[PDB]
Design a protein around this nucleic acid. Structure first.
Lengths: 98, 109, 83, 135, 96, 329, 83, 110, 97
DNA sequence: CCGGCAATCGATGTATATATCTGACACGTGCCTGGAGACTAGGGAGTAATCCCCTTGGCGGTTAAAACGCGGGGGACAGCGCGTACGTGCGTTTAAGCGGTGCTAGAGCTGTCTACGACCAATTGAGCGGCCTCGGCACCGGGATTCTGATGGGCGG
DNA sequence: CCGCCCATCAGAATCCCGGTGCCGAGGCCGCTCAATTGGTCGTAGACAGCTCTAGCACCGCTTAAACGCACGTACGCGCTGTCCCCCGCGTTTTAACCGCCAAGGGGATTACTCCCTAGTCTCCAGGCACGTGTCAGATATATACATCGATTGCCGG
């Protein structure tokens, strides 16, 4: 009989693990490609330094983590443990941003 | 016979520069004139705040069995104190992380 | 050398890892599209402001100072990358 | 002013003939009540009428004297023997009203999100926590 | 051809750190963070003082403006200690 | 001459242009244009046996003092020792025989239709009836109809100052008592002159006009003296004048009678003073003004008028009030 | 002359009227105390800043300009009062 | 001699807002050490454009209500109903403005 | 004339209003609101331009700084019209000087 | 005679102890540019006197709003059952990451020199502060009209 | 035999007029002083040329992460029942609002010093760039140790 964990154990282990480190959780090449593609519309034939891309990635990840914390609070408020898009929409609506 | 020069920080008994702060205030488009007591006040306040943050961060670093301060320790010091957390409420520290925290309902029974 | 279809490079496990750092235990199946949309909007705003600064400075390279100034203008001060 | 006072021969009921010669009688519904049944609107109707009424006007909704007394009482903590101009208290009242109305809007949204119609203190707490006002 | 020199606050931050914790070092990223912190606080206080001076139709910045701006910007505590430090420094300077 | 036909005094052009302006115990008052000037015509039925409007007809030997005082007050505007244009000048006064032409009859009908009247229809008079016609300048609209038309308290002050100056000049020159300043008896006329000039016993002074000019009319119960002879009408036997109620004007006659011990032949200028009182009373109670009192200067002058009203009863005559009270200084 | 217990002057019908303008249909029974507390906190902050502004100018009267400046400093601009 | 009369800079720029006053305010505000000769004209033009836009919307709103004078309620209605102006003044409170009539759909009677 | 004079924008706002809507008025409270609005926008644009000039190690404020501040501050479809109006005004002023 | 509660028993993932190896951090040296000493001119800020406007405090009348009590309808909250969507784990495929090699577009600095902005003197007209008028807008009252909610009376598979 | 629809009834809501009360445009004077006009003059920045840093493009090889599929169970959602607790309406009690009026405190304006800051010249010490070691931390390996999930083993109603 193969060993199997109950649903929820590994999730809590990962929650504890990722709240202790201080690294970037998104691969770098796809993020760089996305940044260049987005900037392509405003001006043609642009160049970037490395630190510019690094700063953009840091700011983006901080923003996403904070938004997810607010989403979790909203989802718990309604007697649930699963997060749904309505929670993201309510959090963004209250926070002020469109 | 000019007397041997004595810097202004020494007379004020500080560790931060007073002449540099005077120059920055003058060439910064803040006012037409700058008095003779403003740089001393500003330097004292800046030194005090720096010392406070540094002491808390050093305590946090020693708690981790290290001897050099890294951004993680600065984040731990700033986020665990009420006044500093209120002052730096809209600031992001690179490679800082977050504070360990789990909601109570999610815990297993 | 036109680039297309790069928003799909923000894979599902990456969003899961960000959520886990956020403190989330269970997730739906429709969350990823919403996350991709909000990330795209945020990036668009910041990059537009940075490029405006760069164009005023009369350069062809985007530096870290432009990104820092744009973030500060939007009210999201960032420490560490100079400035 | 003819040097003497008489009756009203000077004017032949000009105001009445000009207006309200006999139109000054009754208007709207003339018969009210007079029924054993206790006429009553169902709960929730006058609430919507009030909602529609107060979203169209612009005047202040707090009595002035209690607010002024509260402001003076609060201010006396930081310094004694103070004085105020009228417009200062007026500005404080306007800002307070606007803040409270916006907070109530957010609270109502939070209450609806949880599949209810009544607002409870926990909704205010969640709204203030997400807004960033309360840590 | 010469490389232009750039100035920072590293020397003074290191001096203060050696004063408080006499057996602890620091890294480069932390130094950058503290540099940015000092610059930010300087800018905030100076801007508030300038606005305060302009409100009253005055042409000079004195220690009263700095004191009022400090009391206006800083939270409940950290505002008495800063005021005491500034007053002590000014009195010591003017006595010598 | 004498009782000439109405046609001579009233040509068809003037007859067709007559507009009814007023009615009263004396008769009727019309407005027309003659000599390229708006003029008022007062018509009275005299020396008749019939009773009209609740009173019998009036004779000539009692109407003579009326025209005498009217011409005196009209001609005082040309004297050098005391000059003032607060009265109405005399154009022509004449006697008529005949009946009432239908044109003024239909004008009276229209006047009744719009406003109404307190008298009867003047269509019972035959050819043999005798009438008197007086011609006067156009003065303007009465203060009664201008109640909601005044600008502010400054107009009020100017009106009171003008009335006081005119009455003081009259008393100083001809020792005049007119005794019927009710607010339906003063006239306001628009003017462009910035200042008004008045002379008393050789000394001349100026008053701000504020865009108005005041005048007084209806001297039917007035008293005057000249060269040791007095002219007035004794009204000591009809007490219905003193039976009035409902307004302090009704009480001013009783108070004046108490002051003079029911002796009308004596000169007591103080009576005129209380008349001002009543006007001032009206000026504080029965008027609506376009402009609020938000200006501090207007608050100051309003207080000045209040104090004037509450303390002016202590003065002797019009001249004393003009030359002593702080309001005009 | 010391005032005492004036927060009770913010009645219950007044809170109901504010809620009605906000668009609320049913109100629980424990909302009024919460509203009183949050209003007290807001007023404390604003009045403290205004009194600081007044004191600096060596004046003894709080004017509308100090209130406007304090509100702007908090991040809530106000138009129409001598701005 | 004759100095050839006078002509305000607003007349040469074709504007209605003052150009000299804007220059004087830019010089005395401690913004920079020197100020060019074209900046006040640009600033005056921009301010005039924004004023005209807001005033036109407010006047339309006032006419809709059958009133011939503009009051703060009309300014609030004009601002809150236009997306761009609403985003510009997103943290501003107008005295005696009120709110926009709006009721959620769940609360309506069945 | 005893009190010291105070300056506002009332005259120019009234001129603009009478030019857009020929037969409409305005009340005093609305005038105060408009005055505050104009002052606020002036302050925002001037501060942004000053910061831009300081970033680039310049000591003068030109029309380029104003243009870039307008582009940075106003939302889309409002920046373009303002830019066009300002450019037109500057060209007309330069040609006829 | 089971539904339970405790006590094991195995397996998996994380914390802890010891040895080697590096590159980032802590100092030492030389030089040059920015701060300190010394002195003068003039204008911003402090102080006294005076005026007068606006803030505080009092009194009486009235009446509109706050406070209180009660019946009852609709909503908040708990318990239950069912179905499927989400978590855990394994085998296979893909592209990120690292280490080099080569090229050149563009950032960063220096030197010349012209044109644009600061400053000054004489001149003058725009804009604000007092005093004043007045045409029409906003407001109220009544009366009529409408519109909406809450009701009983009915045909029907 | 469960109803689910329509016609009436009453009570708010909105329109139409007539009369009142004041506000927002304007008119005049009178200055004040800030904006315009015509000059000279010193330096900020536009422009042209050069050097060399760092950004871009391509290639080969490893290994870890991303992807697809199978299986089962715990969580979300709909339905029913119960009871408390807010809403609507009538009656009684409190204090807010309006109008008017003195008293005097403190903010605003005017004139007169006079000390503190900017500006200039000379000189040298603090602070920055560059170059070397050595030791705190990173990496690798083995070793407990805490915890999760299943099984046994009696046990009282």
């Amino acid at each position: 009989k193969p060993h199997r964990y109950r649903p929820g154990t590994v999730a809590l282990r990962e929650i504890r693990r990722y709240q202790k480190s201080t690294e970037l959780l998104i691969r770098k090449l796809p993020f760089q490609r996305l940044v260049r593609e987005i900037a392509q519309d405003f001006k043609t034939d642009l160049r970037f330094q490395s630190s510019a891309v690094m700063a953009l990635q840091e700011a983006s990840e901080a923003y996403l983590v904070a938004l997810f914390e607010d989403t979790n609070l909203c989802a718990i408020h309604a007697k649930r443990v699963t997060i749904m898009p309505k929670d993201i929409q309510l959090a963004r609506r209250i926070r002020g941003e469109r | 016979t000019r007397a041997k020069a004595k810097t202004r920080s020494s007379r004020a008994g500080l560790q931060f520069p007073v002449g540099r702060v005077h120059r920055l205030l003058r060439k910064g488009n803040y006012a037409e004139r700058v008095g003779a007591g403003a740089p001393v006040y500003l330097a004292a306040v800046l030194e005090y705040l720096t010392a406070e943050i540094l002491e808390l961060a050093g305590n946090a670093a020693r708690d981790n069995k290290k001897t050099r301060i890294i951004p993680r320790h600065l984040q731990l010091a700033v986020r665990n104190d009420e006044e500093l957390n209120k002052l730096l409420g809209r600031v992001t520290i690179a490679q800082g992380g977050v504070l360990p925290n789990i909601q109570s309902v999610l815990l297993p029974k | 050398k036109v680039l297309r279809d790069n928003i799909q490079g923000i894979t599902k496990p990456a969003i899961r890892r960000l959520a886990r750092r956020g403190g989330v235990k269970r997730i739906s199946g429709l969350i990823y599209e919403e996350t991709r949309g909000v990330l795209k909007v945020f990036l668009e705003n910041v990059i537009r402001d940075a490029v405006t600064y760069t164009e005023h400075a009369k350069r062809k390279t985007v530096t870290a100072m432009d990104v820092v100034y744009a973030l500060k203008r939007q009210g999201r001060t960032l420490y560490g990358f100079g400035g | 002013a003819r040097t003497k006072q008489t009756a009203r021969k000077s004017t032949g009921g000009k105001a009445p003939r000009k207006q309200l010669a006999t139109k000054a009688a009754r208007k709207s519904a003339p018969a009210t009540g007079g029924v054993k049944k206790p006429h009553r609107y169902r709960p929730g109707t006058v609430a919507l009428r009030e909602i529609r009424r107060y979203q169209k006007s612009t005047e202040l909704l707090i009595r002035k004297l209690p607010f002024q007394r509260l402001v003076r009482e609060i201010a006396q903590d930081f310094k004694t023997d103070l004085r105020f101009q009228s417009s200062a208290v007026m500005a404080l009242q306007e800002a307070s009203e606007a803040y409270l109305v916006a907070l109530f809007e957010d609270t109502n949204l939070c209450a609806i999100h949880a599949k209810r119609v009544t607002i409870m203190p926990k909704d205010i707490q969640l709204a203030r926590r997400i807004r960033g006002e309360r840590a | 051809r010469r490389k232009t020199r750039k100035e920072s606050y590293a020397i003074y931050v290191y001096k203060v750190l050696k004063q408080v914790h006499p057996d602890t070092g620091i890294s480069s990223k932390a130094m950058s963070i503290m540099n940015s912190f000092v610059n930010d606080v300087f800018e905030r206080i100076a801007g508030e003082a300038s606005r305060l001076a302009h409100y009253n139709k005055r042409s000079t910045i004195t220690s009263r403006e700095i004191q009022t701006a400090v009391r206006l910007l800083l939270p409940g505590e950290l505002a008495k200690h800063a005021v005491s430090e500034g007053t002590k420094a000014v009195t010591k300077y003017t006595s010598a | 001459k004498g009782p000439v036909p109405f046609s001579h005094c009233l040509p068809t052009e003037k007859l067709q242009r007559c507009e009814k302006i007023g009615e009263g115990v004396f008769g009727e008052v019309f407005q027309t244009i003659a000599d390229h000037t708006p003029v008022a015509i007062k018509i009275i039925a005299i020396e008749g046996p019939d009773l009209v409007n609740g009173s019998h007809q009036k004779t000539f030997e009692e109407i003579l003092p009326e025209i005498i005082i009217s011409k005196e007050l009209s001609l005082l505007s040309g004297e050098v020792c005391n000059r003032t244009e607060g009265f109405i000048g005399l154009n022509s006064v004449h006697c008529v025989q005949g009946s009432y032409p239908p044109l003024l009859l239909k004008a009276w009908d229209h006047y009744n239709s719009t406003k109404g009247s307190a008298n009867d229809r003047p269509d019972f008079f035959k050819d043999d009836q005798l009438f008197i016609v007086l011609e006067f300048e156009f003065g303007g609209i009465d203060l009664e109809q201008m109640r909601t038309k005044l600008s502010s308290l400054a107009t009020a002050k100017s009106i009171l100052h003008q009335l006081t100056a005119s009455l003081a000049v009259a008393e100083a020159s001809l020792r005049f008592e007119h005794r019927d300043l009710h607010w339906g008896n003063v006239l306001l006329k628009k003017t462009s002159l910035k200042k008004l000039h008045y002379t008393l016993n050789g000394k001349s002074s100026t008053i701000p006009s504020c865009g108005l000019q005041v005048s007084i009319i209806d001297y039917t119960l007035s008293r005057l003296e000249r060269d040791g002879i007095v002219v007035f009408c004794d009204v000591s036997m009809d007490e219905d004048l003193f039976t009035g109620d409902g307004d302090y004007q009704f009480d001013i006659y009783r108070l004046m009678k108490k002051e003079n011990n029911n002796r009308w032949g004596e000169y007591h200028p103080y009576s005129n003073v209380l008349w001002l009182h009543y006007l001032t009373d009206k000026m504080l109670k029965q008027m609506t003004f376009k402009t609020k009192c938000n200006t501090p200067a207007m608050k100051q002058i309003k207080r000045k008028i209040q104090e004037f009203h509450r303390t002016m009863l202590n003065f002797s005559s019009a001249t004393d009030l003009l030359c002593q009270h702080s309001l005009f200084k």
